[PDB]
Amino acid sequence: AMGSMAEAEGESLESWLNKATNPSNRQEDWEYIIGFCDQINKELEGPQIAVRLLAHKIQSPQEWEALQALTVLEACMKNCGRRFHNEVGKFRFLNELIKVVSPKYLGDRVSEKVKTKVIELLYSWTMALPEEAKIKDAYHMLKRQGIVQSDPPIPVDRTLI
């Protein structure tokens, strides 16, 4: 029907997400953030499930929950390999981020912090993940539509190209 999402696989991964994105968290709990990446790395459908789960948390109306979700999403990009990158590089996932920033969707009830972090991530990905064509398609369209006026500054280090 809905696959492993409805099964133990999904329930477990969402349980891990709750922990890593609990709005009660004093700050980012990396014990739970990284643990979520590990579960994804061992699960056959970890990436497919995870991105749908992350997309949902990111679209949360509660700020701290969405923000931590964006941090976990970042951790997964650096710890879950191409298999994870490949699922984020599909419109099936990207359209969910677009709803967060477009006023025609959730756009008006999402803090500016969330929307800018989302923009910064998408942009950061166009630089770091050139072989993920769909991500720039989604980014440039946000530009072509005035949602993103000028590319934002992003966290960078020597490992980034």
Partner: peptide, 8 residues
């Protein structure tokens, strides 16, 4: 297997 870009 993928949806079309969400044209806003």
């Amino acid at each position: 297997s993928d949806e079309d870009l969400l044209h806003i």
